[PDB]
């Protein structure tokens, strides 16, 4: 993120520069979920 015009700044691995070039935000998170696939099989197996 370019905090100043003459100075681009990296917000770090934990954060990420916003797409509006206004600042930095906590980067989006990822984890295994029950949405469509993958987890349904093991969940049904455990329930059975």
């Amino acid at each position: 993120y370019l905090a100043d015009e003459f100075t681009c700044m990296d917000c770090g691995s934990g954060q990420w520069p916003t797409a509006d070039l206004t600042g930095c935000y906590d980067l989006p998170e990822d984890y295994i979920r029950w949405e469509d696939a993958w987890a349904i099989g093991p969940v049904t197996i455990a329930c059975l």
């Binding site: 934990g14 980067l27 998170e29 984890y31």
Partner: protein, 49 residues
């Protein structure tokens, strides 16, 4: 009927003490483990490897 349960709970309590010191040294928390090679993603991993 009694000493079997006693020994089972003794072993379970040994495990309980081990896991208790494990969590005492490693109180629950989340690390924002990001793929620094890839970025744009965060894994909310537990606070211990």
């Amino acid at each position: 009927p009694s000493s079997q349960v006693f020994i089972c709970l003794g072993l379970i309590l040994v495990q309980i003490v081990m896991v208790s010191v494990w969590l005492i040294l490693e109180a629950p928390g989340t690390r924002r483990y990001t793929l620094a090679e890839k970025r744009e993603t965060v894994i909310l991993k537990c606070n211990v490897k």
